[PDB]
Amino acid sequence: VPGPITLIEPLSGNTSLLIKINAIHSVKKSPYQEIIIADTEDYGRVLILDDYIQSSYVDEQYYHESLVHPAMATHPNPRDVLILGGGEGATLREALKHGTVKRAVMVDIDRDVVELSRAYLPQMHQGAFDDPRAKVVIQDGFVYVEEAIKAGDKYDVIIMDLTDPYSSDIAKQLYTREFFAKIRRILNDDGVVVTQAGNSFYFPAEYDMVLEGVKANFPIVAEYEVWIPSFGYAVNFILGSLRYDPHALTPSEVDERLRARGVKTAFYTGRVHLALMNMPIHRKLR
Amino acid sequence: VPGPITLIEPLSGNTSLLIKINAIHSVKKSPYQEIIIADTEDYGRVLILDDYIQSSYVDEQYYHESLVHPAMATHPNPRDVLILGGGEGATLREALKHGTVKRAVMVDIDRDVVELSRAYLPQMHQGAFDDPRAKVVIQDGFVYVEEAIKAGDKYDVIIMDLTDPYSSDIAKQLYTREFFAKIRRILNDDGVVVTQAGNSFYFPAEYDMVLEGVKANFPIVAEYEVWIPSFGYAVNFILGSLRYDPHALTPSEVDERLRARGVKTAFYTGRVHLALMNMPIHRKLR
Amino acid sequence: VPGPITLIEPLSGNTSLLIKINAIHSVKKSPYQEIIIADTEDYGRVLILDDYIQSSYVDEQYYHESLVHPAMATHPNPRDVLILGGGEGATLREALKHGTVKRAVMVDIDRDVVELSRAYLPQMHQGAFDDPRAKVVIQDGFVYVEEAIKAGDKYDVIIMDLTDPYSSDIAKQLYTREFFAKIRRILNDDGVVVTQAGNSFYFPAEYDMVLEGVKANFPIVAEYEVWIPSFGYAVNFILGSLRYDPHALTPSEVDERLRARGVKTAFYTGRVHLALMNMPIHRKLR
Amino acid sequence: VPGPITLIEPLSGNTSLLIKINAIHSVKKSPYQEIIIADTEDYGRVLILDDYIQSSYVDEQYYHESLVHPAMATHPNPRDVLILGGGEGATLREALKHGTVKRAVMVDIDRDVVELSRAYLPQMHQGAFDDPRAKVVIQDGFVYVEEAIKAGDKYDVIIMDLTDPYSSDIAKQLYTREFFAKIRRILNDDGVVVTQAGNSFYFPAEYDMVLEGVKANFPIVAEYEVWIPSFGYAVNFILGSLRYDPHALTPSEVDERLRARGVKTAFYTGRVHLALMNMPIHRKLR
Ligand SMILES: CSC[C@H]1O[C@@H](n2cnc3c(N)ncnc32)[C@H](O)[C@@H]1O
Ligand SMILES: CSC[C@H]1O[C@@H](n2cnc3c(N)ncnc32)[C@H](O)[C@@H]1O
Ligand SMILES: CSC[C@H]1O[C@@H](n2cnc3c(N)ncnc32)[C@H](O)[C@@H]1O
Ligand SMILES: CSC[C@H]1O[C@@H](n2cnc3c(N)ncnc32)[C@H](O)[C@@H]1O
Ligand SMILES: NCCCCNCCCNCCCN
């Protein structure tokens, strides 16, 4: 039973997780957030920001593969990729696997998350930060997107891997209808956006606000979720597309794009893609 | 932060859930298990057996529909149904929705679970216990199956809705290779068995033992899982079939059987079926 | 870890107690406070007010005997006794044991605490509420003392058994310098006051405020403490005397007063009295 | 709730403490026990062995002074002192304050406790380990006492500061009748033994076993307790004496021995001694 040293991970406010801690690797009060890197018995090494597990060694591939590959596989030739957040470098790692990618930009507000992840979470980034195709920019993603509009920059796929919409003051401006309109302005005509949107079961109001924002700006929208044990819930993803429908890809087409692009995964396959496109998201039923 | 009255729900031993309790309706130490019916803020009313949530008002339909309908929809004409466990009566409720069912027998070892569920959990059974097609038998499922073999009783679908294989002494004899051989002897030649098998991520050894038991006795075996928030995990299900392959059903075939049989659901559909058949089960990836 | 049903009892705010609950007897939102009467495995039946255990079956006699008998034994002939609080009736029970007592008045603000204690905590009051010498008044103790001054009422011993000074808004006016001045005005010239004063170790600032209030109004002040397991701390008592010094009583004199007055106890004796007068109170030493 | 990083300190099994951790300094799985040195908000720096707090910066002086000084002050000229356990070096620190002491031997089974205490808990040992009068021996205390009998060694005062009798497999042989007989064989004819004996309230059976073991071997036995906040209980001590009765010492005699011997304390005085000798130990009263 889960001690003697325990993380109390908030889940809903009326439910919390008690997680056995084996070791604390680093604690850093950054100007933006409290960072903890720790070893958990169940999940191995974790990044914690303001008390919330962001990623674990034993299940981060479920999160990062589900966040990245459906969007990347839906785009027929994703060359220019923008990531907002993704501080541990695993979102960048998954995006770079696509041989079509020539330029991947990752924008995180917090240099301490990136530097502490570089040192203490090598199985997350796996060298992604040092890939010649990758540029790591330390900036508020809101400001970065405003400056990208003025420069008329355009991307094929935009991946939002931010802190939770229901908890995170630093990410709140990037989850609005108005921000999704700004995202559309820096997408090519066949562009795709994907974002994590917290949890539809425990935080339906915050989830619905994000969903309405994407639906108001993109004509094709897929909603899918994946159980991440270390989070205590099935994370919700919202994918917005200007041309291509992720629901239209067959397992064979997904598997052929992965093979052609040199993409190796622990989890994501054509069959996973089909399941994600067909499983409705969880809500409270009474 | 949950309290002042809290349920400490074990999950893995290295992770536990802290769940705020609004009221305790009943506590009963039966000879078989400790029974608690309580109101939780997140999940509404719950049945707890030996500290483990069995079912909640807000998400039990995810559990009971996922346990019952894939097996029932795979059988082309399920007339005789046997349920082992299912004390709250929701498994019986779901099976009875199939208009093909003429006889449903439910066998639970613990009369106190059934009677406390009848009184305190009416939204679970919804009158299923009193359906003219239903017989509720209080007996050890092991004993009932031995007596069914000697009587040469035979069923189209057998549903095992027992306490967890990783925790429950009272159910341990019903999760063995030898017990699945006994189940095959009370199935018709085109019969199907489904059982909950705990959790593949947190309890892989106990999950694998159940899987090997089913694979040794049945030529067609499907594995699928669904996130149940009140459990803290995606419950694993194992379906054993003598003739019909659930992987072969299309969404349209599932939806046509549901329509023809008068089956109304909150969750299960042809698309859910397709997703369950295509989503690999969770394991620790590192 | 204690469960599955647990009380999270706040202790210091940086430490809390997890207490196994076997049953909840009553929950009542009164106009003043939330009341819970519950069975704990370690402490048996408890009264809880706003999350704080007030008393337990297994250790309340340590609390009530330590609160009452040192003051009562110090007064050479206590005839008129006033109790502020003491909702469960055990303070009254201990005071009434003194054969010198002719009139005991108990004043609690909360009729629900008294009535629920009468019904659900009979081993606390043990009939004290119905003793012909006893008068139970439902009133704010602040108002009762103002009206006692105007009537020129006077008492030999005043016992304050209120909710904690560090947590309880309803009692806060009764813990001030100004309130102890009002108490002195309704004491005879040889009168004694005793109050519980929370805990000197975990709540030194609130303890010190009560102590300065008593020292400003009374020339003789004794401080003593007793470990109450169900509280998670040694409760602090402050005794204010106008004439008689509890430090001057010998074990033999205490034991003779108890014998002469027909006082039977589970804990308090002359030797206990000597120990209480000689044990310094706990503080943080670093 | 105290968090996000928490120590779950077992107390009774039906009560546990949740203690906020500010930092973890060191974690060592020794062959004998799990060792944690941590900073707590309430208690400052702590040593934890197998989940149990052994000592805290804010209250260890209550524990170590109460364990050592009553026995040392009862002996009229304690020259040779043996300590079994006392890994953090505070028991040794208190014993060495007595100017009569020429030789103090401290025997702990676990070199990791001693070395981690030397480095991370300097306010506990305060250089005691390096005092010319002190010998620190890493050995099982059982073996050390058997070898002391064979060498015919004799001591004036033996202090047992071991892990708890109710929890600690490594110490269990040192808490038996037979072990107290071995202790008597290495005492001078006016010798005194003192041991911590867990807690009489929460662990009465284990406490009573230790008490019967001492009473079978020593004609004078004193029982006393002190509240240690960081433990969640009043630790019980049992003192066994061959000639001198600690109940016979007056405050003045104790204070004169402390003054003559150059003993400076934060807590222990003649009045404390009197209180310890007069306070009965806590038991469940219903
Ligand atoms: C750990 S993956 C989540 C990341 O979101 C990042 N993040 C939060 N808010 C913003 C923002 N406004 N702009 C960019 N990155 C952000 C955090 O710094 C964290 O590393
Ligand atoms: C609440 S659903 C799980 C049910 O499994 C039941 N159960 C456990 N073991 C057996 C068994 N051996 N035979 C029948 N029912 C059982 C329990 O009594 C519970 O009601
Ligand atoms: C349970 S024993 C302590 C009692 O103090 C009572 N109490 C708190 N505030 C006041 C007050 N202002 N006057 C009288 N009783 C009070 C509470 O109702 C409780 O029953
Ligand atoms: C922390 S103070 C208690 C000490 O008792 C020690 N201890 C436990 N069992 C024995 C034993 N059998 N012999 C010597 N020391 C022991 C532990 O190593 C610990 O440092
Ligand atoms: N939950 C209560 C913690 C109990 C810890 N027991 C005290 C151990 C005494 N021996 C070592 C004390 C430090 N020298």
Ligand nearest the Cα atom of residue D31: 4
* Alpha carbon distance C275, D278 (integer Å): 6
Comparing CA positions, the residue from A67, A116, A119, A74 lying closest to residue A90 is A67
Decide whether any atom of ligand 2 lies within 6 Å of the B165 Cβ: no
D48 and D67 co-located in one domain: no
Estimate the crossing angle of helix B251-261 against helix B60-74, to 10 degrees: 100
Partners of C160 in the β-ladder: C84, C195
Residue C253 lies in a domain: no
Number of compact structural domains in chain A: 2
CA-based R_g, chain B, Å: 18
Helix residue ranges per DSSP H, chain A: 60-74, 90-96, 111-120, 122-125, 141-150, 177-185, 204-215, 251-261, 270-278
Comparing CA positions, the residue from A112, A46, A48, A107 lying closest to residue A81 is A107
Tokens of D264: 């400076």
3-state secondary structure of A218: coil
3-state secondary structure of A100: coil
What HEC string does C53-79 produce?
EEEECCCHHHHHHHHHHHHHHHCCCCC
D140 is in an annotated binding site: yes
* CB D246 within 8 Å of CB D222: yes
Where on the phi/psi map is residue B29: left (φ > 0), alpha (ψ -120 to 50), or beta? beta
D42 and D167 co-located in one domain: no
3-state secondary structure of A239: strand
Residue A261 lies in a domain: no
Query: Which helix (H) or strand (E) segment is D176 a member of?
Result: none
* Alpha carbon distance C161, C167 (integer Å): 14
Decide whether any atom of ligand 5 lies within 6 Å of the D224 Cβ: no
Cis preceding-peptide flag for A4 (omega within 30 of 0): yes
Best residue among A45, A109, A147, A176 to mutate for probing ligand 1, ranked by most atoms within 8 Å of CB: A109
3-state secondary structure of C263: coil
* Alpha carbon distance D273, A58 (integer Å): 57
Partners of B224 in the β-ladder: B237
CB-closest option in D17, D19, D229 to C201: D229
For an interface test with C, the pick among B1, B5, B17 (most C C-beta atoms closer than 10 Å) comes out as: B5
3-state secondary structure of A14: coil
Sheet containing strand D103-108, edge to edge, reads: D134-138, D103-108, D80-85, D155-161, D187-196, D233-241, D220-228
* CB C118 within 8 Å of CB C126: no
Query: Which helix (H) or strand (E) segment is D141 a member of?
Result: helix D141-150
Residue B255 lies in a domain: no
Distances (CA, A) of C188 to C81, C86, C154: 11, 22, 6
CA-based R_g, chain A, Å: 18
Decide whether any atom of ligand 3 lies within 6 Å of the C108 Cβ: yes
Angle at CA of residue D87, ends D84 and D89, nearest 5°: 100
Neighboring chain A residues of C1 at a CB cutoff of 8 Å: 1-3
* CB D26 within 8 Å of CB D35: yes
B26 and B108 co-located in one domain: no
* Alpha carbon distance A134, A112 (integer Å): 18
Distances (CA, A) of B252 to B11, B248, B255, D181: 37, 12, 5, 84
CB-closest option in D1, D12, D280 to C16: D1
CB-closest option in D18, D44, D279 to C15: D18
Angle at CA of residue B31, ends B27 and B32, nearest 5°: 90
* CB C55 within 8 Å of CB C67: no
Strands A5-10 vs A15-29: parallel, antiparallel or unpaired? antiparallel
C62 and C194 co-located in one domain: yes
User: Which chains pack against C, by 3+ Cβ pairs within 8 A?
Assistant: A, B, D
Q: Of all atoms in ligand 5, which is nearest to the CA of residue D87?
A: 14
Partners of D34 in the β-ladder: D29
3-state secondary structure of A57: coil
* CB C145 within 8 Å of CB C183: yes
B13 is in an annotated binding site: no
* Alpha carbon distance C79, C44 (integer Å): 34
Ligand 4, atom 6: closest residue by C-alpha: D85
**CA diameter of chain A:** 55
Last residue of a domain, one of C54, C69, C84: C54
Q: How far is A138 from chain B (nearest CA, A)?
A: 30
* Alpha carbon distance B132, A41 (integer Å): 51
Q: What is the DSSP code string of chain B?
A: ---SEEEEEESSSSEEEEEEEEEEEEEEE-SS-EEEEEEETTTEEEEEETTEEEEETTTHHHHHHHHHHHHHHHSSS--EEEEEE-TTSHHHHHHHTSTT-SEEEEEES-HHHHHHHHHH-HHHHTTGGG-TTEEEEES-HHHHHHHHHHTT--EEEEEEEPSPTTT-TTTGGGGSHHHHHHHHHTEEEEEEEEEE---TTT-HHHHHHHHHHHHTT-SEEEEEEEEEGGGTEEEEEEEEESS--GGG--HHHHHHHHHHHT---SS--HHHHHHHHHSPPP----
* CB A236 within 8 Å of CB A269: no
C64 and C82 co-located in one domain: yes
Centre of ligand 2 from the C-alpha of residue B90, in Å: 13
User: Which chains pack against B, by 3+ Cβ pairs within 8 A?
Assistant: A, C, D
B169 is in an annotated binding site: no
Tokens of C237: 């008592």
Comparing CA positions, the residue from B169, D163, B157, B29 lying closest to residue C22 is B29
Tokens of C223: 């401080």
User: Which chains pack against A, by 3+ Cβ pairs within 8 A?
Assistant: B, C, D
* CB A61 within 8 Å of CB A251: no
Estimate the crossing angle of helix A204-215 against helix A177-185, to 10 degrees: 40
Distances (CA, A) of C136 to B84, B123, C68, C92: 59, 47, 17, 10
3-state secondary structure of C162: coil
Tokens of B28: 């009963």
3-state secondary structure of A34: strand
Question: What single letter denotes the amino acid at residue A233?
Answer: Y
Query: Which helix (H) or strand (E) segment is D88 a member of?
Result: none
Which of D80, D110, D112, D161 does the annotation list as catalytic? Answer: D161
Residue A66, CB-side half-sphere exposure with 13 Å CA sphere: 25
Tokens of D136: 């620190």
Residues constituting chain B: 286
Ligand nearest the Cα atom of residue D196: 5
Ligand nearest the Cα atom of residue C165: 3
Task: Find all residues with CB under 8 Å of B235, minimum gap 6, and list them.
Answer: B63, B66, B196, B198, B199, B225, B226, B228
Burial of A178 (0-12, 13-18, 19+ CB in 10 A): exposed
* Alpha carbon distance D41, D229 (integer Å): 13
3-state secondary structure of D265: coil
D161 and D120 co-located in one domain: yes
Residue A113 lies in a domain: yes
Sign of the CA dihedral running B166, B169, B174, B176: positive
Comparing CA positions, the residue from A16, A64, A62, A229 lying closest to residue B202 is A229
Tokens of A269: 């396959």
3-state secondary structure of C18: strand
Distances (CA, A) of C266 to B252, C69, C73, C167: 77, 12, 16, 30
Strands B187-196 vs B233-241: parallel, antiparallel or unpaired? antiparallel
Which DSSP state fits C266?
S
Burial of B222 (0-12, 13-18, 19+ CB in 10 A): buried
Q: Residue D199: how many CB atoms within 10 A of its CB?
A: 26
* CB D87 within 8 Å of CB D160: no
D14 and D140 co-located in one domain: no
* Alpha carbon distance C124, A139 (integer Å): 65
- The rounded Cα C189 to chain-centroid distance in angstroms is 23
* CB C58 within 8 Å of CB C44: yes
B77 and B149 co-located in one domain: yes
* Alpha carbon distance D172, D141 (integer Å): 11
Which of A80, A112, A161, A164 does the annotation list as catalytic? Answer: A161
Question: What single letter denotes the amino acid at residue B18?
Answer: L
Neighboring chain A residues of B267 at a CB cutoff of 8 Å: 280, 285
Long-range contacts of A185-189 (CB under 8 A, 24+ apart): A185/A149, A186/A82, A186/A145, A186/A148, A186/A149, A186/A153, A186/A154, A186/A155, A186/A158, A187/A154, A187/A155, A187/A156, A187/A158, A187/A242, A188/A80, A188/A154, A188/A155, A188/A156, A188/A242, A189/A242, A189/A243
Q: How far is C201 from chain B (nearest CA, A)?
A: 24
User: Which residue reads 């839906």 in tokens?
Assistant: A74
Task: Find all residues with CB under 8 Å of B143, minimum gap 6, and list them.
Answer: none
* Alpha carbon distance C129, C127 (integer Å): 6
Distances (CA, A) of C219 to B2, C160, C208, C242: 47, 19, 17, 6
* Alpha carbon distance C108, C86 (integer Å): 7
Q: How far is D150 from chain A (nearest CA, A)?
A: 41
* Alpha carbon distance D263, D244 (integer Å): 20
Question: What single letter denotes the amino acid at residue C170?
Answer: I
What HEC string does B196-223 produce?
ECCCCCCCHHHHHHHHHHHHCCCCEEEE
Query: Which helix (H) or strand (E) segment is C170 a member of?
Result: none
Centre of ligand 4 from the C-alpha of residue D170, in Å: 7
**CA diameter of chain B:** 55
Query: Which helix (H) or strand (E) segment is D220 a member of?
Result: strand D220-228
Neighboring chain C residues of B5 at a CB cutoff of 8 Å: 5-8, 21, 24, 36
Last residue of a domain, one of C9, C25, C54: C54
Comparing CA positions, the residue from C170, C41, C154, C36 lying closest to residue C105 is C154
A238 and A226 co-located in one domain: yes
Tokens of A155: 């991307």
Task: Find all residues with CB under 8 Å of B1, minimum gap 6, and list them.
Answer: A8, A10, A13, A16, D1, D3
Burial of A8 (0-12, 13-18, 19+ CB in 10 A): buried
Q: How far is D60 from chain C (nearest CA, A)?
A: 9
User: Which residue reads 């009374």 in tokens?
Assistant: C218
* CB D63 within 8 Å of CB D20: no
Residue D229 lies in a domain: yes
Active site residue C245: no
Decide whether any atom of ligand 5 lies within 6 Å of the D9 Cβ: yes
Question: What single letter denotes the amino acid at residue D125?
Answer: H
* CB B195 within 8 Å of CB B214: yes
Strands B187-196 vs A155-161: parallel, antiparallel or unpaired? unpaired
Phi then psi for residue B46, to 5 deg, are -130, 150
CA-based R_g, chain C, Å: 18
Burial profile D271-282: b = 16 or more Cβ within 10 angstroms, e = fewer: bbbbbbbbbebb
C152 and C65 co-located in one domain: yes
Residue A193 lies in a domain: yes
User: Which residue reads 């606000």 in tokens?
Assistant: A209
Comparing CA positions, the residue from D59, D14, D111, D19 lying closest to residue D235 is D59
Distances (CA, A) of B61 to B49, B229, B264, D145, D175: 19, 12, 12, 66, 56
Comparing CA positions, the residue from C104, C221, C211, C222 lying closest to residue C156 is C104
Neighboring chain B residues of D3 at a CB cutoff of 8 Å: 1
Which of C161, C190, C208, C255 does the annotation list as catalytic? Answer: C161
* Alpha carbon distance B205, B166 (integer Å): 9
B80 and B202 co-located in one domain: yes
Q: Residue B147: how many CB atoms within 10 A of its CB?
A: 11
* CB A1 within 8 Å of CB B1: no
Comparing CA positions, the residue from B11, B228, D167 lying closest to residue A20 is B11
* CB D3 within 8 Å of CB A8: yes
Phi then psi for residue C203, to 5 deg, are -125, 60
User: Which residue reads 């893995």 in tokens?
Assistant: B12
* Alpha carbon distance A186, A183 (integer Å): 5
Distances (CA, A) of C71 to B268, C81, C237, D280: 71, 11, 10, 20
* Alpha carbon distance C113, C120 (integer Å): 10
Domain containing residue B17: 1-54
Comparing CA positions, the residue from C155, C156, C203 lying closest to residue C175 is C203
Residue C267 lies in a domain: no
For an interface test with B, the pick among A21, A53, A279 (most B C-beta atoms closer than 10 Å) comes out as: A279
Task: Find all residues with CB under 8 Å of C43, minimum gap 6, and list them.
Answer: C19, C53, C56, C57, C58, C59, C229, C230
C19 and C49 co-located in one domain: yes
Burial of D8 (0-12, 13-18, 19+ CB in 10 A): buried
Residue C86 lies in a domain: yes
Decide whether any atom of ligand 2 lies within 6 Å of the B87 Cβ: yes
Comparing CA positions, the residue from A87, A260, A261, A81 lying closest to residue A163 is A87
* Alpha carbon distance A284, A281 (integer Å): 10
* CB A93 within 8 Å of CB A128: yes
Decide whether any atom of ligand 3 lies within 6 Å of the C171 Cβ: yes
Decide whether any atom of ligand 1 lies within 6 Å of the A140 Cβ: yes
Query: Which helix (H) or strand (E) segment is C179 a member of?
Result: helix C177-185
Beta-strand (E) ranges in chain C? Answer: 5-10, 15-29, 34-40, 44-49, 52-56, 80-85, 103-108, 134-138, 155-161, 187-196, 220-228, 233-241
Task: Find all residues with CB under 8 Å of C133, minimum gap 6, and list them.
Answer: C96, C101, C102, C103, C104
Comparing CA positions, the residue from A253, A285, A278, A275 lying closest to residue A62 is A275
* Alpha carbon distance C167, B218 (integer Å): 64
- Determination technique for this PDB entry? X-ray
